[PDB]
Every structure is written in C-alpha cells, then in structure tokens.
Amino acid sequence: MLTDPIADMLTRIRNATRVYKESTDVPASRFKEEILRILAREGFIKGYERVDVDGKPYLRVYLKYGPRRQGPDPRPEQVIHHIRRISKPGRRVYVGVKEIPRVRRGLGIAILSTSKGVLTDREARKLGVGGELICEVW
Amino acid sequence: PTINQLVRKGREKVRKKSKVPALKGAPFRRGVCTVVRTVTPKKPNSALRKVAKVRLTSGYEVTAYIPGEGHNLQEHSVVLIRGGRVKDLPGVRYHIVRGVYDAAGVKDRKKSRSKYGTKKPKEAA
RNA sequence: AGCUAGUUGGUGGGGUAAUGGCCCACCAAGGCGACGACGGGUAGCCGGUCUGAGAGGAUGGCCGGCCACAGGGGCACUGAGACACGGGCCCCACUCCUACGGGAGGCAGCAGUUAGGAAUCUUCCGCAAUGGGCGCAAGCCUGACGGAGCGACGCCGCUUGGAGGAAGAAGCCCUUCGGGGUGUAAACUCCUGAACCCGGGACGAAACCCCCGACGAGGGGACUGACGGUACCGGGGUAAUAGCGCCGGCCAACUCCGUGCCAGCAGCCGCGGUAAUACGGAGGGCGCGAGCGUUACCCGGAUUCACUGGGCGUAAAGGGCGUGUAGGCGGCCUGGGGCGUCCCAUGUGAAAGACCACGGCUCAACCGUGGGGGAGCGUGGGAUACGCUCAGGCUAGACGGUGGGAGAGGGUGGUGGAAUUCCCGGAGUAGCGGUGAAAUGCGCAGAUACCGGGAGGAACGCCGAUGGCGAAGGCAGCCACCUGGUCCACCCGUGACGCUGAGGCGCGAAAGCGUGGGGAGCAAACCGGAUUAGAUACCCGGGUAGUCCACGCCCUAAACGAUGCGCGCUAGGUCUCUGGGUCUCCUGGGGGCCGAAGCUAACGCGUUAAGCGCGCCGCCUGGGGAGUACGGCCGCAAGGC
RNA sequence: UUCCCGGGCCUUGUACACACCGCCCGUCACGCCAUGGGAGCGGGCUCUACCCGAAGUCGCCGGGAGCCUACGGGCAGGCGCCGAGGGUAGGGCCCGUGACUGGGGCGAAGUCGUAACAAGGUAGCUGUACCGGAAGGUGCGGCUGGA
RNA sequence: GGAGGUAAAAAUGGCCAAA
Ligand SMILES: NC[C@@H]1O[C@H](O[C@H]2[C@@H](O)[C@H](O[C@@H]3[C@@H](O)[C@H](N)C[C@H](N)[C@H]3O[C@H]3O[C@H](CO)[C@@H](O)[C@H](O)[C@H]3N)O[C@@H]2CO)[C@H](N)[C@@H](O)[C@@H]1O
Ligand SMILES: [Mg+2]
Ligand SMILES: [Mg+2]
Ligand SMILES: [Mg+2]
Ligand SMILES: [Mg+2]
Ligand SMILES: [Mg+2]
Ligand SMILES: [Mg+2]
Ligand SMILES: [Mg+2]
Ligand SMILES: [Mg+2]
Ligand SMILES: [Mg+2]
Ligand SMILES: [Mg+2]
Ligand SMILES: [Mg+2]
Ligand SMILES: [Mg+2]
Ligand SMILES: [Mg+2]
Ligand SMILES: [Mg+2]
Ligand SMILES: [Mg+2]
Ligand SMILES: [Mg+2]
Ligand SMILES: [Mg+2]
Ligand SMILES: [Mg+2]
Ligand SMILES: [Mg+2]
Ligand SMILES: [Mg+2]
Ligand SMILES: [Mg+2]
Ligand SMILES: [Mg+2]
Ligand SMILES: [Mg+2]
Ligand SMILES: [Mg+2]
Ligand SMILES: [Mg+2]
Ligand SMILES: [Mg+2]
Ligand SMILES: [Mg+2]
Ligand SMILES: [Mg+2]
Ligand SMILES: [Mg+2]
Ligand SMILES: [Mg+2]
Ligand SMILES: [Mg+2]
Ligand SMILES: [Mg+2]
Ligand SMILES: [Mg+2]
Ligand SMILES: [Mg+2]
Ligand SMILES: [Mg+2]
Ligand SMILES: [Mg+2]
Ligand SMILES: [Mg+2]
Ligand SMILES: [Mg+2]
Ligand SMILES: [Mg+2]
Ligand SMILES: [Mg+2]
Ligand SMILES: [Mg+2]
Ligand SMILES: [Mg+2]
Ligand SMILES: [Mg+2]
Ligand SMILES: [Mg+2]
Ligand SMILES: [Mg+2]
Ligand SMILES: [Mg+2]
Ligand SMILES: [Mg+2]
Ligand SMILES: [Mg+2]
Ligand SMILES: [Mg+2]
Ligand SMILES: [Mg+2]
Ligand SMILES: [Mg+2]
Ligand SMILES: [Mg+2]
Ligand SMILES: [Mg+2]
Ligand SMILES: [Mg+2]
Ligand SMILES: [Mg+2]
Ligand SMILES: [Mg+2]
Ligand SMILES: [Mg+2]
Ligand SMILES: [Mg+2]
Ligand SMILES: [Mg+2]
Ligand SMILES: [Mg+2]
Ligand SMILES: [Mg+2]
Ligand SMILES: [Mg+2]
Ligand SMILES: [Mg+2]
Ligand SMILES: [Mg+2]
Ligand SMILES: [Mg+2]
Ligand SMILES: [Mg+2]
Ligand SMILES: [Mg+2]
Ligand SMILES: [Mg+2]
Ligand SMILES: [Mg+2]
Ligand SMILES: [Mg+2]
Ligand SMILES: [Mg+2]
Ligand SMILES: [Mg+2]
Ligand SMILES: [Mg+2]
Ligand SMILES: [Mg+2]
Ligand SMILES: [Mg+2]
Ligand SMILES: [Mg+2]
Ligand SMILES: [Mg+2]
Ligand SMILES: [Mg+2]
C-alpha cells in the first residue's frame, strides 16, 4: 500500500543502479516530480518524463552512470553511489537554517522540503528557509 | 526496535553493582580479626596464604588477605581493610593495610615500602 | 493495578491582605488511573561542576538563586512582614539548680569539647575596608565581614646550585676476566647565591566630620589600618632537603644471587615444583619529583541500551498460531485553515562560572574590564513544500458482484474390506514361540500349520509423490449432510473503506486429569527368562494405566523454515501441483532445486531472501545460579504464565 | 582377506587438539560461602476504630460569685468543637533472628558407575508420564541439531 | 528399479605443566 512512496522511489532507483538499467517506472505524483527535478538539475540522472503504463500515470527515470572501467569487474562507476531517506514517517526530521548537515564537505547534496518548495542544502541555506530534511545523496 | 517502541519502552541503563560492599563506597574500614589462619588457593596454584576473618565497624564479617612475609596479627588485633580481591582465594575480596594500628610493616623490606607499610632504613648512606 | 470522605462539583457561610473544601452547614455523585493513579524506595532543586568528538552520562561540595528546618511534635501572640535560630505557651526525651514546692537550658551561628568514623581546623586579631541595625549627629553594636593560624587537601610559582673536570679515582654490580657499568657522576677549581642579618617601609583611605557657599551644587581643611613593621625596596651574606612507584605482554625500563607450587606476586592474561628478565635482595635502568603510589567513587574507552550509533536461521534474541481493542503508520488530484514545521522582529533566558581579547598582582594560580551568540518560552508579522484538519474528486490499494477450479480444511451421521486377538465346529499331529545363541512361555487337558462360522476394538494397503489442504497444532478406506478458507476469467459495483496490533479473546500435537463408556493389537509401571562384575537397561515371554468415544479440564514442545506480519523494487535456468487464453506458447496462484547483482563471520540466502526499503508488533544485552526462589494470577492435581 | 595386530589413499562424523592411554556426566564423602522453607520470636515504618486528651485559635455563657476610666461595654473565669501526645485492639509492608530442612555455587590429585561427544557401542535431543543408588531407563508424540 | 535399510560383545586412564 506504499507506506512511504518517497523512500520507495529512492529504492527503485537504488535497485536499478546496481543492475545498470536505462530507466525505471515509478508512481506519479507532483511531489515526486520535484524530487526528480532536483536529481536532474544536480546531474544525478538524465531526466524524467510523464509516461502512461496500463492507463496509470508513471514516471520513467532515466538513470546515469560513469565510464566503463577496465580490468576485472569492468562495471562502470555510479554517479549515484547511495541515496536514502532521512525524514521517515516513523521519525520526522525537521531542521532550521543553522542545523543543516554538510554532505561530504559539499560534494554531495541534501534534498529537503521547505515552504518555498523542494530545495537543496545549498539553495535552502542561501535563501535561509530550511525544513523537513527529505534525503541526502552522496 | 522501532522508533515507536523506543518512545514507549525506552533504553535501560546499565547500573553496575559494586564488587566491594564497604557501606556506600568507603575507601577504608577499621575492624578486628576473629581468627587468623591459612587457606589453600585454586587449581593453578598451591601454597598457604595468610588470611584473617575480620569483623569491622559495620557488623559485617568478611575475610581479608595479609600481604608480605611475616606478620603480628592475632585473634584480638585491630586492622584496617583496604579493598581488592585475591584471584586465587575464593571469598576473599579485601586486603589488610600493613602499617596500621595492630598490623606491623614487613621487616627487612626495602623495595616497595609504600605498600606493606615499611619505614625508610638508614645505614649511614 | 485499581485509588478516592472534604473524596469531585454546586449553593450559602466562617477565615485571609487575597482566590481556593482552606474550614463549616445543606445538596448532587462525582473525581483520578497503563499518557502508569495509588503504594513502596531514594533524594532538597537550579545556575552550574566532572567527563565526553558530539549526542549523551554522572553529579549538585566552595560561590550565587529558591525551598525547608532551629532538640522531636503542636500552637498561637505582637507585628507591614514570623507560626519566628539566639521571642512566648504546652507535651515528650535528655542536662543542670533545688530549702523537695518548683526553677533554668536548647551551637544546623563563631571558636572549642565529647562520641561516631578512614577523615576534616583556631576556645586567634579588628570593626581599618565593604555591608547591615539604630541615631539628624557625635557615635554604639555587628564571630556578616576583612584578616591572621593549623592541614602538601587542590592548583600555581620557587629552591636543594651554575660553568669546568679522567680513555675516565675509591667502593659496589656484571664478565667470556681482556674488560664493561654506575659515570662528569664524585672529589677538586672558579662563579652566582634560597636561607639568614641590618636599614627603610606601604597601596588598600575617602567620605561621614569642619569652614566658604542658603547645613543643596561647587570648593577647601582635618581624623582614622586589624593584616603589620607583613608585602615590597636597598645593603651584607651560607653551596644549602629527595623522595616515591615501576622494569613478562598490555607498558618505558635487564642482569646477578637467594628460594624451589615453599616463601610469595597478581588490574587482565597469569608467574613460582633447582640455572624465575613475573617471588626477595643487589646493581643498573624507566617514569614522575615535594611529591609518588594504593583504596573508593564518576565519565571515557563500551558503537557493551546503539537518537546521532546495535542486533534476533545456526553466536543471546521472532511471541506456538490466529482474531482483534487502544495505539502507531498510511495511495493520487484540487482548494480552505496554518496545529506541527520554517523565517523575521521583540521581551526573557540574573550574577558568577565557560570561551575570546586586553589588563592587575615581578610570572602563574588567582582576579578585573570589555565582546559573542546559545538552547528553550511569551508576543507580533510572514511563508504553505511536507506532516495535520476540513471540503470535493479519483482510481492502481482493499472489499464486493457474475461465471467457473482444485484440495486428507473442519464438524455430524452412516458404511466397506484386509489383518490381529478370542469363542465355536471340523480335520490333524510331538512340538510351537523366540534369539546372536538360548531360556522363561505355550503344548498329548489335542497346542502351533489348515478350513468354516461368530464376536469385538482400532487403523485404513495399493492409489501415494520429491503431491495436496490449513493461521498454527495438524489433516489419508467409502457415501451423504452442514461448513471454513483459497485460486482464475470478466473487468461489473463501493470507493481509502488500508497495514500492524500492547491488552483481551479463541484455537492449540503428545503426555497428563475428572465423569461415564469401550478395550482387539500395542504398551509406561510391574513380574519373569536371558546378558553382565553388577542390569532397577538394551534382547525375549507376560502385563496395568494409557492408547479409543462423548463432555469438561490441562496450554507444554526441537509448537522448526530454530527465519513475525503487510507492501514496493532487483537476471535467469529447471522439475512439479492447480486455473485461464487467439491452449506451439503466453499469463496468474502454489510447492522444490541450481544460481545474476547483492548480503553474510562463515555455512549459506538468493522474486517461497537471510538482497534493496517503509510501516507496526514481539524479543536479546557474557556464562553458571535459573526458567530456580519469593510474590501475584491460572489449575482438581500434575503443574503453567 | 570375513575375523585379530600394525600401516597407506580417499571420504564421513567429532563436544578430541600434551590429540581415545582423549573427553566427559550425575549421585555419594569432606570443607567454605550465600540463599529458600521453618514451630515461631524480636524490631522499624505505616493504616483503621475507639478511650483519655495539654497549650492554643475559634464559638457560646459570663450567671445564685468576681475586677474595670464612659456600663446594650471590656477583662478574669466557665463550657464546647478541633487538637500535640498517650492508651487499647486489629491489620499492611520491610528488616533481623530461629531447632531443623531444601536445593545452589566454590574448594590439585576421595568413592560408585558410563549417560553424552566417533551408529560413543541402544542415533541424539525434546515436551509429558512412570520408574530407578546415580548418571539415567522406558512409554506416547515431535525435531535434524542423524543415517 | 525407487524407497522400506544391518549391530551380540567388552568398563576405566590421578593432578599441574613448553614462545
Ligand atoms: N555446578 C557444579 C556442580 O558440580 C557437581 O559436582 C561436584 C562433585 O560431584 C564433584 O566432586 C568431584 C568428583 O566428581 C570426582 N569424581 C572426584 C573429585 N575429587 C571431586 O572433586 C571435588 O571434591 C574435592 C574434595 O573431595 C575438592 O577438592 C574439589 O575441589 C571438588 N571439585 O565436584 C563438584 C563440586 O566441586 C556436578 N558436576 C554438577 O552438579 C555441577 O557441575
Ligand atoms: Mg564492607
Ligand atoms: Mg602454578
Ligand atoms: Mg612488587
Ligand atoms: Mg463539610
Ligand atoms: Mg534526605
Ligand atoms: Mg563516546
Ligand atoms: Mg542538635
Ligand atoms: Mg496582627
Ligand atoms: Mg528570631
Ligand atoms: Mg543557638
Ligand atoms: Mg560550632
Ligand atoms: Mg573514634
Ligand atoms: Mg565596620
Ligand atoms: Mg559602616
Ligand atoms: Mg572570615
Ligand atoms: Mg671505579
Ligand atoms: Mg655540574
Ligand atoms: Mg590607605
Ligand atoms: Mg558637605
Ligand atoms: Mg638581596
Ligand atoms: Mg608507574
Ligand atoms: Mg618494554
Ligand atoms: Mg636462580
Ligand atoms: Mg611485574
Ligand atoms: Mg625482582
Ligand atoms: Mg568505566
Ligand atoms: Mg555509550
Ligand atoms: Mg538505532
Ligand atoms: Mg550486538
Ligand atoms: Mg544452541
Ligand atoms: Mg540461539
Ligand atoms: Mg514463528
Ligand atoms: Mg486502529
Ligand atoms: Mg497522505
Ligand atoms: Mg503554525
Ligand atoms: Mg550569566
Ligand atoms: Mg599580566
Ligand atoms: Mg479348535
Ligand atoms: Mg503331536
Ligand atoms: Mg479361522
Ligand atoms: Mg469497474
Ligand atoms: Mg477524501
Ligand atoms: Mg492482524
Ligand atoms: Mg492440547
Ligand atoms: Mg491426548
Ligand atoms: Mg491422551
Ligand atoms: Mg496418575
Ligand atoms: Mg481418561
Ligand atoms: Mg504384549
Ligand atoms: Mg560388563
Ligand atoms: Mg516387553
Ligand atoms: Mg521443522
Ligand atoms: Mg513443528
Ligand atoms: Mg522459541
Ligand atoms: Mg512460482
Ligand atoms: Mg557472487
Ligand atoms: Mg540457492
Ligand atoms: Mg507480530
Ligand atoms: Mg517448565
Ligand atoms: Mg598410495
Ligand atoms: Mg574411554
Ligand atoms: Mg587432552
Ligand atoms: Mg529465613
Ligand atoms: Mg453599651
Ligand atoms: Mg493516636
Ligand atoms: Mg522471619
Ligand atoms: Mg542451609
Ligand atoms: Mg542413551
Ligand atoms: Mg556411552
Ligand atoms: Mg553403551
Ligand atoms: Mg535398542
Ligand atoms: Mg547411545
Ligand atoms: Mg522422554
Ligand atoms: Mg524400566
Ligand atoms: Mg509437527
Ligand atoms: Mg572407577
Ligand atoms: Mg586424564
Ligand atoms: Mg600446579
């Protein structure tokens, strides 16, 4: 029944990066589109698009990978090493503007929902809003 | 456990118990011996360790160890309990401070005199 | 695990500076509790202090704030203020004085005594400073205070010298005797100079007071120091205390001799029973140094209660299974509110402490002056993504409808055949049974082997499987009735109706228990025969409960997949059970094996996860003691939780 | 080449590893300690009911009796409720102790047997029931942590 | 040809002890 549709989307992507697929179908929702829009603007995925599957609205997330390595295990490197939910429905996480975590000295991002909309750790710190720490991507 | 279970039950503290019941952790306790004798150690060792059943100022009566070589403890000699058990003696979890009221220091002792309570010898040097 | 009589509310009063059952009269029957009442145990609370990367953990001593007590207990009086520490009344315990009838006292104020204890100080000096009371003032009082004393209790500073000095004295230790070490260490030579002696000598003190000025503002003058002749300055001047722990690994520092599981050491691992770097001493070395070790306690390390930050197949840990109450959590779209959430502004968050600068004591410890924001909470304003609520809509979740499918799912009644045992009849003999071999046992009283008839109880061969069904336990001849679950096709209706589920409730193999029935085979206990040193066992011959039915209990287990439930995602290959189809093949549910990625300590798991994630429940926190004891609840008992 | 002794290669089981001349279980004997039950005994705290009840506030009387400067008044005094505490009785919790008794831990070399680990010589374990010096045996059912 | 699968034996080993 999708107790957590936001964290489920992050796992549908995490399960696809390890199998190296081109795209995967995730349920459609305006809030999930804001999360994927940040993933595309930050360069983690190629993008997304509103598709139709058996009459139901879905979103095809075009995955992204690194160059093909050489030697044993030539599987390409991941552009998304690991993505996971922080604020879960069992334990809600809300942060201000001073209590914002630094994801890998700024190398990684931290998507978080604010009153201004879905922003990153850099955008919410510049606008000075903050809010529900949705997820961290390293 | 889940987050809903932690707000309900929570985490239990350790609350470790004392290994030396000296009445609220007193560093020392005065007492008088009742019997002075020797008891055999455990399997890995074999000797005749000098111990004494001491009845202290708190009603308790526990045996303590007598360190060093040679003593002057009798059936009616007052001593001072220190603490610390003897690995080889079952039941003995205390030590007797040498150099106190009726416990004399180890004679002819020269290396470790802070322990065994021995004075500084002077031989014109 | 239930509690509650002024108990909860109302009306009218008493009392208070003032609300209030604070107390009283009458009326109503309420009030509190798993969001943990009531009861028991412990404890003054905080700023802070210690630790910690942080989050946290521990703690509340000096200092500052609040509270509570003044020998134990009750009470009022005066008063702005007290139920009053050096005011009052009474009771009790103790102490003292008594002409014996009736009198005084309250160190948890400063010192000091006694007792307890491991342990905690002077019956010191002055009101000079600050502050308090009274007084207009002069001034008086002030064990508050400012100081001095004792104590390495802590922190900080300082001394026991500095520069030379032998291829390297004496003694002591080791040795392979050649020498090596203590060791520039010493003596010795120069230099400086803590102690001590002499002289000088404070800051802390400026007002109150007195004059001019109107006893105002402003200006001028005078008095006063406990510390103390201390600090400090100047002159002179003596080479002038070193101790403690450790040297097997952790952990830094190695040799000799003595002892021989003795004496002894030990924080963990562990050393010692004749050559011990681990015992005792010596030399030498290592670490600190007026300190060094030990004990006790707090934090850390311990991510070893895991919020940050842990686990549960086999290491400790999935509840035996289900149904569900509370609770926790919840699909897609559109608005309203703005509770959570976020931002801004404002007030508060005392001082001290902490941190950063600067400065005063010759430095520091200590201390002074600036500066920086916390966290929380109150108020005003704004933002609305998400969580919440309200209203509307949706279909992918869920449930229903129509038509079909398989199955040992459950209960009730009836019914079939094989086999065993016994009875009856006929035929027929000298043994049958049983074992590793035997013997008990049965048998000429006619046994075992055979035929025929009858009685009774229990279990259902082949089919049958690596099979199916159920939530679990568990379910197998055949027929019928009643009845549960489940799967598929059609996509027909409702429309978020969902997941989990502490408690409760129900089911729950075998054994066991109660009442009644039944009892063929089997078979605890029991009895014989064997075996053996012994047999309370294994083997053999008998055999009672029980095994079977009805009703009611008992609630356990290796109740196992040692794997809680639901949902979404992540290669496949192959066997099989069961539906649907344009039945070669595709698709859905279920049971197995091998295995991508991945996971695991490994074995192994791997779309029937132990992989990747979310929700909820249950459980673990080293082993023995122990699933024990006590208590509680349940049970007829055994016994169970 | 069945059997007895020794040996080689592979495989299988193990709780053995100074290694089966291994390991290991329970009872019994002796010693130390702690703890449960136990005729009971003692103490501490607390609760309920009643009896007596100081001081004191409050309320009534202040009269056949008192003192007063204003007297429809005040004071002394008398009575009553509450009340510290004391007494009697019965309960609740906690602690100390008690002849004796139960099991437990711990203590180099004591006695009895062989239960388990190699099909441990009867696969082992397990719930329950009965029996037995003791490990344990047996019945019924279950498990693979056996073939 | 796949399951169902065969016991006659026989107890014990003092304590501590090498990087
Ligand atoms: N939890 C300990 C228990 O000990 C029990 O066993 C206890 C006794 O049976 C056993 O006694 C053993 C004995 O088994 C063995 N056959 C002989 C041995 N000398 C005895 O030893 C015992 O007694 C001697 C003095 O006689 C003591 O010096 C020694 O420390 C002690 N272990 O010693 C144990 C107590 O020390 C059972 N094993 C069991 O219930 C459990 O393991
Ligand atoms: Mg003690
Ligand atoms: Mg030894
Ligand atoms: Mg030593
Ligand atoms: Mg009343
Ligand atoms: Mg207290
Ligand atoms: Mg830490
Ligand atoms: Mg007193
Ligand atoms: Mg008054
Ligand atoms: Mg007073
Ligand atoms: Mg006084
Ligand atoms: Mg005093
Ligand atoms: Mg004393
Ligand atoms: Mg003064
Ligand atoms: Mg003054
Ligand atoms: Mg003072
Ligand atoms: Mg020399
Ligand atoms: Mg020198
Ligand atoms: Mg001055
Ligand atoms: Mg003037
Ligand atoms: Mg000088
Ligand atoms: Mg040291
Ligand atoms: Mg070293
Ligand atoms: Mg020697
Ligand atoms: Mg040592
Ligand atoms: Mg030595
Ligand atoms: Mg610690
Ligand atoms: Mg911790
Ligand atoms: Mg956690
Ligand atoms: Mg763990
Ligand atoms: Mg186990
Ligand atoms: Mg386990
Ligand atoms: Mg289970
Ligand atoms: Mg609910
Ligand atoms: Mg929602
Ligand atoms: Mg709001
Ligand atoms: Mg402050
Ligand atoms: Mg300075
Ligand atoms: Mg016949
Ligand atoms: Mg015959
Ligand atoms: Mg016949
Ligand atoms: Mg429809
Ligand atoms: Mg709706
Ligand atoms: Mg459920
Ligand atoms: Mg049952
Ligand atoms: Mg039964
Ligand atoms: Mg039965
Ligand atoms: Mg019976
Ligand atoms: Mg019966
Ligand atoms: Mg029979
Ligand atoms: Mg024999
Ligand atoms: Mg038999
Ligand atoms: Mg199983
Ligand atoms: Mg089972
Ligand atoms: Mg279990
Ligand atoms: Mg399948
Ligand atoms: Mg792999
Ligand atoms: Mg596999
Ligand atoms: Mg569950
Ligand atoms: Mg039990
Ligand atoms: Mg060969
Ligand atoms: Mg043997
Ligand atoms: Mg061995
Ligand atoms: Mg007792
Ligand atoms: Mg009048
Ligand atoms: Mg009373
Ligand atoms: Mg008693
Ligand atoms: Mg006893
Ligand atoms: Mg056996
Ligand atoms: Mg055996
Ligand atoms: Mg045997
Ligand atoms: Mg057998
Ligand atoms: Mg066996
Ligand atoms: Mg059994
Ligand atoms: Mg038997
Ligand atoms: Mg079963
Ligand atoms: Mg023997
Ligand atoms: Mg042996
Ligand atoms: Mg030994």
Side-chain angles (χ1 to χ4, degrees):
Chain A
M1 64 292 299
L2 294 175
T3 64
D4 191 351
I6 300 304
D8 176 68
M9 179 175 68
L10 312 182
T11 64
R12 295 167 84 97
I13 296 169
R14 195 189 310 115
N15 284 300
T17 61
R18 274 65 167 155
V19 70
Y20 297 97
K21 285 186 181 294
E22 291 176 73
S23 176
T24 54
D25 298 6
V26 299
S29 85
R30 291 165 58 248
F31 183 42
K32 288 162 87 81
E33 291 182 285
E34 291 285 321
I35 300 166
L36 295 172
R37 185 191 64 184
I38 301 300
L39 295 172
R41 187 263 302 279
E42 284 292 330
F44 284 106
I45 58 170
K46 293 197 295 181
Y48 71 94
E49 293 177 350
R50 289 180 176 176
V51 300
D52 193 8
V53 174
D54 292 324
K56 305 305 174 188
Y58 280 89
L59 263 71
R60 285 182 184 154
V61 179
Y62 295 103
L63 288 93
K64 185 173 180 174
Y65 306 116
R68 185 190 183 281
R69 291 164 57 87
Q70 66 180 31
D73 187 22
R75 294 197 292 268
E77 188 180 6
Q78 298 285 348
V79 302
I80 297 172
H81 302 86
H82 197 280
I83 179 169
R84 70 165 181 84
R85 188 76 182 277
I86 296 170
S87 179
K88 295 175 278 187
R91 190 196 196 284
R92 292 289 181 191
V93 178
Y94 299 111
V95 299
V97 297
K98 291 187 177 294
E99 302 288 344
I100 299 172
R102 190 183 305 120
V103 181
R104 283 165 61 100
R105 302 292 183 184
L107 270 65
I109 68 165
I111 296 172
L112 54 96
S113 180
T114 64
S115 66
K116 305 299 180 184
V118 177
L119 278 71
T120 64
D121 61 338
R122 179 196 64 83
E123 292 181 331
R125 195 190 302 275
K126 188 173 181 179
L127 291 178
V129 278
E132 182 171 334
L133 184 59
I134 302 299
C135 61
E136 65 175 21
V137 178
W138 30 278
Chain B
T2 64
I3 309 100
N4 197 37
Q5 288 177 352
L6 291 176
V7 297
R8 290 193 299 113
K9 264 61 180 171
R11 296 295 192 175
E12 183 185 286
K13 297 183 189 300
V14 291
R15 284 290 194 93
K16 62 183 71 65
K17 291 189 80 173
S18 178
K19 301 179 195 301
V20 50
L23 276 194
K24 295 182 287 184
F28 302 109
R29 276 285 187 254
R30 182 185 66 180
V32 67
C33 298
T34 63
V35 62
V36 291
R37 65 193 297 278
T38 60
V39 65
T40 64
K42 287 200 292 184
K43 189 179 287 186
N45 292 136
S46 178
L48 292 177
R49 277 72 188 275
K50 283 81 179 174
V51 296
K53 193 182 289 183
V54 177
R55 191 201 73 253
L56 64 155
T57 57
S58 63
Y60 299 128
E61 187 168 307
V62 183
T63 63
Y65 186 70
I66 305 164
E69 291 181 4
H71 61 82
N72 62 337
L73 302 180
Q74 291 181 15
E75 183 168 330
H76 290 96
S77 65
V78 61
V79 297
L80 191 150
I81 300 301
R82 184 191 72 197
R85 74 187 184 98
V86 176
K87 180 79 158 59
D88 286 332
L89 300 180
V92 177
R93 295 185 295 170
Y94 304 79
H95 272 71
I96 295 169
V97 172
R98 301 201 68 164
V100 296
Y101 328 91
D102 287 345
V106 178
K107 61 191 72 174
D108 292 291
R109 181 80 186 189
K110 290 187 71 179
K111 283 186 168 58
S112 297
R113 305 194 323 278
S114 172
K115 302 167 190 173
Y116 315 125
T118 302
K119 303 293 189 291
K120 175 80 167 182
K122 185 177 185 295
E123 291 81 3

